[PDB]
Each structure stands twice: as structure tokens, then as C-alpha cells.
Design a protein around this ligand. Structure first.
Ligand SMILES: C/C=C/CC/C=C/CC/C=C/CCCCCCC(=O)OC[C@H](COP(=O)(O)OCCN)OC(=O)CCCCCCC/C=C/C/C=C/CCC
Lengths: 16, 241
């Protein structure tokens, strides 16, 4: 779920 | 080299390799300097943070790349969750081809380690991983694998037809079709004497997948023994499934 989503990856991809 | 224009587009986000090597080496030196004489990271922990930093550099590569940068974040996540370890393997083998020498491993930091050191100090699981990687490097050296082909392979790894539930699957089909075509054009024009180069390159892709899986398995047991440092990208990818 959201628990297994890699937080650092998501943060990197979310940045503009 | 005559180069298909598509491959020129792909090449535009390549890093200055020796600069990145030096930046990573400087990072690891700063990590160790931040640490007291007695709290220094282990070799294994340092090697994990080196792979971590490499992965950051890979993510920066993908996020800025043509095509990939037009996907929604949740598609980007799905692609990278599928291929992260294949891309770290591919990065590694290409580095061995262009910077490395037979007999030693060339690390992303620019340091070299004799395989005989590794054979005498590492366990069977790591040794077998190193053996399989060496076989792959031998093949790619033999083929005179170059940067143009490397960037095509990265794109074919990244835009994987194995990935379910994408919002823009059509772009994956397009990358597969058009990058295969550009790669074949490239090999046929630039290595005509190797009549099967395109197909021999492509035969390495399932081998990279296999190695990547064996690597994940190795890191997974090392994690079970508490040995993989956490708070980083590497360990998160490993746990994402
Ligand atoms: C996911 C794929 C990422 C690929 C990126 C490329 C990474 C380069 C691999 C580097 C190996 C360096 C070893 C140099 C240390 C010299 C002494 C030695 O052999 O270490 C033994 C130690 C204990 O032996 P041990 O056998 O663990 O210990 C048993 C006895 N204690 O060995 C280590 O410190 C291991 C370092 C490897 C950790 C890197 C993190 C990512 C892991 C990838 C798995 C390796 C893939 C290689 C395929 C190319």
C-alpha cells in the first residue's frame, strides 16, 4: 500500500 | 559514428561520468569524516551508501530524460520500481566496459578492487554474483559495447512491457518499437562486421534481469541480518516489492 511506497523516490519524482 | 537522431535525443541526459564518480567519492569521504574514529561505517555499509548515491544519480537521469519526463508521477514510480536494480547492474557493467580493466572491479568512486581480494574475503553468494557479472562484462567488452548502445539499453530497461497498470502504456510500446529500430540502425551502420550485434545485445537483457534478482536476494538476506543501512533510497526500493 502507501506503506510500501518508497518515500524518498516519491519525493524525488514529485519535485519540479 | 553515424548516429540516429533518436539516439542523439537519448544521449542528451547522460552525465559527465568522471564528475559523477568524483562527486560520489567526495560524498563517501565526507560521510566518513563526519564520523568519529570509532563510528566509521563498515566496508559493507560504505558500499551500500555508494549504491544509494548511484541510484540517486539514476533517478536524476530518468526524471530529466526525454519521454520519461512526460509521464505522470505514478507511472514514473511504477517504471522505476520495476527496473531500479536492473539499471544499477547495467550502470555497473557499462562502467566496467569503458573505465575498468580485466582482473579488477571499477567502482563508481573510481577505485579498483582486484577480484582476487573479493574471492578471498567474500562469501559464496557474493562471489557467484561477481562471477555472473564478470561473464556479462566479458560479453559486452567482446562486442565493443558503446555509449550509443548503452543509452538504448537503458531506455529499453526503463520502458518495460512487464509493467502493469500504467496510465500511458502506449509510450512504453513506442519506446520499445522506436528504440529497438534505432539501435538496429545504429549497429548495422557502425559495426557492420558484427552481423548479429543487435541481437547479441538484446540477449543480455534477460541476463541483466537475472543478475538483478540474484543481487536483490543477496541484499535481502543482508537486510535480514540488520547489515544494510536504512534511511535511504536503496533499502526503500528493496522493500517496495
Ligand atoms: C543492486 C545492484 C547494485 C550494483 C551496483 C554495483 C556494486 C559494486 C559491487 C562492489 C563490490 C565491492 C567489494 C569490495 C570489498 C573488498 C573486500 C570484499 O570482498 O568485501 C567483502 C564484503 C562482505 O562479503 P559478503 O560475502 O557479503 O560477506 C560474507 C562473509 N562475511 O563485501 C561487500 O562489502 C559487498 C558490497 C556490495 C554491496 C553493494 C550494495 C548493492 C548490492 C549489490 C549486490 C552486488 C551486486 C554485484 C553484481 C555486479
Amino acid at each position: 500500500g502507501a506503506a510500501s511506497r518508497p518515500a524518498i523516490l516519491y519525493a524525488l519524482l514529485s519535485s519540479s | 559514428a553515424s548516429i540516429p537522431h533518436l539516439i542523439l535525443e537519448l544521449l542528451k541526459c547522460e552525465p559527465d561520468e568522471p564528475q559523477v564518480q568524483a562527486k560520489i567519492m567526495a560524498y563517501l569521504q565526507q560521510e566518513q569524516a563526519n564520523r568519529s574514529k570509532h563510528e566509521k561505517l563498515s566496508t559493507f555499509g560504505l558500499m551500500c551508501k555508494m549504491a544509494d548515491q548511484t541510484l540517486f544519480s539514476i533517478v536524476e537521469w530518468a526524471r530529466s530524460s526525454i519521454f520519461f519526463r512526460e509521464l505522470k508521477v505514478d507511472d514514473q514510480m511504477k517504471l522505476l520500481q520495476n527496473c531500479w536494480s536492473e539499471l544499477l547492474i547495467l550502470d555497473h557493467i557499462y562502467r566496467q566496459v569503458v573505465h575498468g580493466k580485466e582482473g579488477s572491479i571499477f567502482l563508481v568512486t573510481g577505485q579498483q578492487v582486484d577480484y582476487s581480494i573479493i574471492a578471498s574475503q567474500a562469501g559464496a553468494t557474493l562471489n557467484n554474483l561477481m562471477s555472473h557479472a564478470q561473464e556479462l562484462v566479458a560479453k559486452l567488452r567482446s562486442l565493443q559495447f558503446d555509449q550509443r548502445e548503452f543509452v538504448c539499453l537503458k531506455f529499453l530497461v526503463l520502458f518495460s512491457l512487464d509493467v502493469k497498470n500504467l496510465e500511458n502504456f502506449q509510450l512504453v510500446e513506442g519506446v520499445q518499437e522506436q528504440v529497438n529500430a534505432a539501435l538496429l540502425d545504429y549497429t548495422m551502420c557502425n559495426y557492420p562486421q558484427q552481423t548479429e550485434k543487435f541481437g547479441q545485445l538484446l540477449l543480455r537483457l534477460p541476463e541483466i534481469r537475472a543478475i538483478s534478482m540474484q543481487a536483490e536476494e543477496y541484499l535481502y538476506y543482508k537486510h535480514l541480518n540488520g547489515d544494510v543501512p536504512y534511511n535511504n533510497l536503496l533499502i526503500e526500493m528493496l522493500h517496495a516489492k
